[PDB]
Design a protein around this ligand. Sequence first.
Ligand SMILES: NC(=O)c1ccc[n+]([C@@H]2O[C@H](COP(=O)([O-])OP(=O)(O)OC[C@H]3O[C@@H](n4cnc5c(N)ncnc54)[C@H](OP(=O)(O)O)[C@@H]3O)[C@@H](O)[C@H]2O)c1
Ligand SMILES: Nc1nc(=O)c2nc(CNc3ccc(C(=O)N[C@@H](CCC(=O)O)C(=O)O)cc3)cnc2[nH]1
Ligand SMILES: [Mn+2]
Ligand SMILES: [Mn+2]
Ligand SMILES: [Mn+2]
Length: 159
Amino acid sequence: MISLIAALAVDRVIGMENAMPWNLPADLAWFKRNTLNKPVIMGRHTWESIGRPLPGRKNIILSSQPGTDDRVTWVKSVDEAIAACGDVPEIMVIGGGRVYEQFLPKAQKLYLTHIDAEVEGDTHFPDYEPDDWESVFSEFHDADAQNSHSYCFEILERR
Ligand SMILES: NC(=O)c1ccc[n+]([C@@H]2O[C@H](COP(=O)([O-])OP(=O)(O)OC[C@H]3O[C@@H](n4cnc5c(N)ncnc54)[C@H](OP(=O)(O)O)[C@@H]3O)[C@@H](O)[C@H]2O)c1
Ligand SMILES: Nc1nc(=O)c2nc(CNc3ccc(C(=O)N[C@@H](CCC(=O)O)C(=O)O)cc3)cnc2[nH]1
Ligand SMILES: [Mn+2]
Ligand SMILES: [Mn+2]
Ligand SMILES: [Mn+2]
Protein backbone atom coordinates (compact mmCIF):
# COMPACT_ATOMS: atom_id res chain seq x y z
CA MET A 1 0.00 0.00 0.00
CA ILE A 2 1.20 3.49 -0.94
CA SER A 3 0.28 6.52 1.16
CA LEU A 4 1.04 10.21 0.71
CA ILE A 5 1.63 12.53 3.66
CA ALA A 6 1.72 16.31 3.30
CA ALA A 7 0.97 19.59 5.04
CA LEU A 8 -1.02 22.09 2.94
CA ALA A 9 -1.51 25.78 3.53
CA VAL A 10 -4.29 27.76 1.85
CA ASP A 11 -4.70 27.02 -1.88
CA ARG A 12 -2.73 23.75 -1.50
CA VAL A 13 0.59 25.57 -1.11
CA ILE A 14 3.29 23.23 0.18
CA GLY A 15 6.53 25.16 -0.28
CA MET A 16 8.35 28.32 -1.24
CA GLU A 17 11.95 28.58 -2.44
CA ASN A 18 12.65 24.95 -1.49
CA ALA A 19 11.53 25.56 2.08
CA MET A 20 8.46 25.40 4.28
CA PRO A 21 8.21 28.86 5.89
CA TRP A 22 5.87 28.00 8.76
CA ASN A 23 6.74 26.17 11.99
CA LEU A 24 4.10 23.83 13.48
CA PRO A 25 5.74 21.45 15.96
CA ALA A 26 2.51 19.49 16.46
CA ASP A 27 2.41 18.71 12.75
CA LEU A 28 6.03 17.58 12.66
CA ALA A 29 5.22 15.29 15.59
CA TRP A 30 2.30 13.87 13.58
CA PHE A 31 4.62 13.38 10.60
CA LYS A 32 7.11 11.47 12.73
CA ARG A 33 4.48 9.25 14.34
CA ASN A 34 2.98 8.32 10.97
CA THR A 35 6.30 7.66 9.21
CA LEU A 36 8.56 6.08 11.83
CA ASN A 37 9.62 2.51 11.00
CA LYS A 38 8.35 2.82 7.41
CA PRO A 39 10.17 3.56 4.15
CA VAL A 40 9.89 7.16 2.97
CA ILE A 41 10.19 8.14 -0.71
CA MET A 42 11.12 11.71 -1.58
CA GLY A 43 12.33 13.69 -4.52
CA ARG A 44 15.78 15.21 -4.70
CA HIS A 45 14.62 18.77 -3.96
CA THR A 46 12.88 17.64 -0.78
CA TRP A 47 16.00 15.70 0.24
CA GLU A 48 17.99 18.92 -0.08
CA SER A 49 15.32 20.82 1.87
CA ILE A 50 15.37 18.37 4.79
CA GLY A 51 19.16 18.32 4.72
CA ARG A 52 19.83 15.03 6.54
CA PRO A 53 18.52 11.45 6.69
CA LEU A 54 15.36 10.95 8.71
CA PRO A 55 16.22 8.51 11.52
CA GLY A 56 14.32 5.30 12.01
CA ARG A 57 13.11 5.18 8.41
CA LYS A 58 14.50 3.83 5.16
CA ASN A 59 15.14 6.99 3.10
CA ILE A 60 14.66 6.54 -0.65
CA ILE A 61 15.52 9.48 -2.94
CA LEU A 62 14.32 9.79 -6.54
CA SER A 63 16.81 11.43 -8.88
CA SER A 64 17.75 11.01 -12.53
CA GLN A 65 21.42 11.47 -11.60
CA PRO A 66 23.77 9.33 -9.49
CA GLY A 67 23.48 9.57 -5.74
CA THR A 68 25.85 11.66 -3.67
CA ASP A 69 25.39 10.15 -0.18
CA ASP A 70 25.41 6.47 0.81
CA ARG A 71 23.42 7.04 4.02
CA VAL A 72 20.26 6.89 1.85
CA THR A 73 19.06 4.82 -1.11
CA TRP A 74 19.01 6.42 -4.56
CA VAL A 75 16.67 5.28 -7.33
CA LYS A 76 15.97 6.46 -10.87
CA SER A 77 12.25 5.70 -11.42
CA VAL A 78 8.96 5.29 -9.62
CA ASP A 79 8.95 1.52 -10.14
CA GLU A 80 12.48 1.23 -8.73
CA ALA A 81 11.52 3.34 -5.72
CA ILE A 82 8.61 1.02 -4.94
CA ALA A 83 10.76 -2.09 -5.40
CA ALA A 84 13.47 -0.71 -3.10
CA CYS A 85 10.91 -0.62 -0.28
CA GLY A 86 10.54 -4.37 -0.27
CA ASP A 87 7.52 -6.18 1.10
CA VAL A 88 6.24 -3.74 3.71
CA PRO A 89 2.62 -2.96 4.62
CA GLU A 90 2.80 0.79 3.98
CA ILE A 91 5.10 2.97 1.87
CA MET A 92 5.09 6.68 2.76
CA VAL A 93 5.60 9.23 0.00
CA ILE A 94 6.77 12.50 1.53
CA GLY A 95 6.93 14.77 -1.53
CA GLY A 96 7.59 17.20 -3.02
CA GLY A 97 5.14 18.46 -5.61
CA ARG A 98 6.47 16.55 -8.61
CA VAL A 99 6.77 13.33 -6.62
CA TYR A 100 3.25 13.66 -5.16
CA GLU A 101 1.87 14.08 -8.69
CA GLN A 102 3.41 10.78 -9.80
CA PHE A 103 2.37 8.70 -6.80
CA LEU A 104 -1.18 10.06 -6.32
CA PRO A 105 -2.76 7.66 -8.87
CA LYS A 106 -1.11 4.73 -7.07
CA ALA A 107 -2.03 5.82 -3.54
CA GLN A 108 -4.70 4.31 -1.32
CA LYS A 109 -4.40 6.73 1.61
CA LEU A 110 -3.65 10.43 2.16
CA TYR A 111 -2.51 11.87 5.48
CA LEU A 112 -3.16 15.60 5.06
CA THR A 113 -2.63 18.48 7.47
CA HIS A 114 -4.67 21.53 6.53
CA ILE A 115 -2.99 24.63 7.95
CA ASP A 116 -4.93 27.89 8.30
CA ALA A 117 -2.12 30.03 6.91
CA GLU A 118 -1.85 32.18 3.79
CA VAL A 119 1.49 31.38 2.19
CA GLU A 120 3.02 32.69 -0.97
CA GLY A 121 4.38 29.55 -2.53
CA ASP A 122 5.83 28.11 -5.69
CA THR A 123 4.86 24.46 -5.11
CA HIS A 124 1.39 22.97 -4.69
CA PHE A 125 -0.07 19.64 -3.74
CA PRO A 126 -1.77 18.01 -6.75
CA ASP A 127 -5.37 18.73 -7.48
CA TYR A 128 -7.02 15.51 -6.56
CA GLU A 129 -10.63 14.56 -7.28
CA PRO A 130 -12.65 14.76 -4.03
CA ASP A 131 -15.20 12.15 -5.11
CA ASP A 132 -12.48 9.50 -5.12
CA TRP A 133 -11.68 9.82 -1.41
CA GLU A 134 -13.45 9.11 1.88
CA SER A 135 -12.51 11.02 5.02
CA VAL A 136 -12.00 8.44 7.78
CA PHE A 137 -10.37 10.64 10.43
CA SER A 138 -10.25 14.35 11.14
CA GLU A 139 -9.05 16.25 14.18
CA PHE A 140 -9.10 20.05 14.48
CA HIS A 141 -6.74 22.05 16.69
CA ASP A 142 -6.78 25.73 17.51
CA ALA A 143 -3.52 27.68 17.58
CA ASP A 144 -1.63 27.69 20.88
CA ALA A 145 1.63 29.00 22.35
CA GLN A 146 3.65 26.44 20.35
CA ASN A 147 1.63 26.33 17.10
CA SER A 148 0.83 29.72 15.64
CA HIS A 149 -1.92 28.60 13.23
CA SER A 150 -4.95 26.39 13.57
CA TYR A 151 -4.68 23.08 11.77
CA CYS A 152 -6.69 19.99 10.87
CA PHE A 153 -5.28 16.44 10.64
CA GLU A 154 -7.21 14.37 8.10
CA ILE A 155 -6.83 10.82 6.79
CA LEU A 156 -8.53 9.93 3.49
CA GLU A 157 -8.85 6.57 1.95
CA ARG A 158 -9.53 5.88 -1.71
CA ARG A 159 -13.12 4.70 -2.12
N1 LIG B 1 4.40 20.79 2.96
C1 LIG B 1 4.79 19.56 2.67
O1 LIG B 1 4.16 18.62 3.07
C2 LIG B 1 5.96 19.32 1.81
C3 LIG B 1 6.42 18.03 1.63
C4 LIG B 1 7.51 17.81 0.82
C5 LIG B 1 8.10 18.87 0.17
N2 LIG B 1 7.65 20.11 0.36
C6 LIG B 1 8.24 21.25 -0.35
O2 LIG B 1 8.16 20.90 -1.74
C7 LIG B 1 9.20 21.59 -2.47
C8 LIG B 1 10.00 20.61 -3.32
O3 LIG B 1 9.08 20.04 -4.28
P1 LIG B 1 9.48 19.96 -5.83
O4 LIG B 1 8.23 19.61 -6.60
O5 LIG B 1 10.26 21.18 -6.24
O6 LIG B 1 10.53 18.75 -5.89
P2 LIG B 1 10.52 17.21 -5.47
O7 LIG B 1 9.29 16.56 -5.93
O8 LIG B 1 10.98 17.11 -4.02
O9 LIG B 1 11.83 16.74 -6.25
C9 LIG B 1 11.83 16.74 -7.70
C10 LIG B 1 13.09 16.01 -8.17
O10 LIG B 1 12.98 14.62 -7.86
C11 LIG B 1 13.51 13.83 -8.91
N3 LIG B 1 12.45 13.03 -9.49
C12 LIG B 1 11.11 13.17 -9.36
N4 LIG B 1 10.49 12.23 -10.02
C13 LIG B 1 11.43 11.42 -10.60
C14 LIG B 1 11.39 10.27 -11.40
N5 LIG B 1 10.22 9.69 -11.80
N6 LIG B 1 12.56 9.75 -11.76
C15 LIG B 1 13.69 10.31 -11.39
N7 LIG B 1 13.82 11.38 -10.63
C16 LIG B 1 12.68 11.94 -10.25
C17 LIG B 1 14.15 14.81 -9.91
O11 LIG B 1 15.48 14.99 -9.44
P3 LIG B 1 16.69 15.31 -10.46
O12 LIG B 1 16.50 16.79 -10.95
O13 LIG B 1 17.92 15.08 -9.66
O14 LIG B 1 16.53 14.20 -11.57
C18 LIG B 1 13.26 16.04 -9.69
O15 LIG B 1 13.90 17.24 -10.10
C19 LIG B 1 10.05 22.31 -1.40
O16 LIG B 1 9.54 23.64 -1.27
C20 LIG B 1 9.71 21.53 -0.12
O17 LIG B 1 9.88 22.32 1.03
C21 LIG B 1 6.61 20.34 1.14
N1 LIG C 1 2.24 16.84 7.79
C1 LIG C 1 3.46 16.99 7.24
N2 LIG C 1 4.23 17.90 7.80
C2 LIG C 1 5.46 18.17 7.37
O1 LIG C 1 6.18 19.02 7.91
C3 LIG C 1 5.93 17.39 6.24
N3 LIG C 1 7.16 17.60 5.77
C4 LIG C 1 7.55 16.89 4.75
C5 LIG C 1 8.93 17.08 4.19
N4 LIG C 1 9.86 17.86 5.03
C6 LIG C 1 10.27 17.57 6.32
C7 LIG C 1 10.99 18.49 7.06
C8 LIG C 1 11.40 18.18 8.33
C9 LIG C 1 11.11 16.95 8.93
C10 LIG C 1 11.57 16.64 10.31
O2 LIG C 1 12.40 17.32 10.90
N5 LIG C 1 11.03 15.56 10.90
C11 LIG C 1 11.39 15.09 12.24
C12 LIG C 1 10.52 15.80 13.30
C13 LIG C 1 10.24 15.04 14.58
C14 LIG C 1 9.43 15.92 15.50
O3 LIG C 1 9.46 17.12 15.35
O4 LIG C 1 8.69 15.39 16.48
C15 LIG C 1 11.18 13.61 12.11
O5 LIG C 1 11.96 12.79 12.77
O6 LIG C 1 10.32 13.16 11.39
C16 LIG C 1 10.40 16.03 8.18
C17 LIG C 1 9.98 16.34 6.91
C18 LIG C 1 6.69 15.94 4.18
N6 LIG C 1 5.47 15.72 4.64
C19 LIG C 1 5.06 16.44 5.67
N7 LIG C 1 3.80 16.25 6.19
MN1 LIG D 1 11.05 1.65 -15.95
MN1 LIG E 1 7.38 -8.01 -3.34
MN1 LIG F 1 -3.25 31.48 10.35
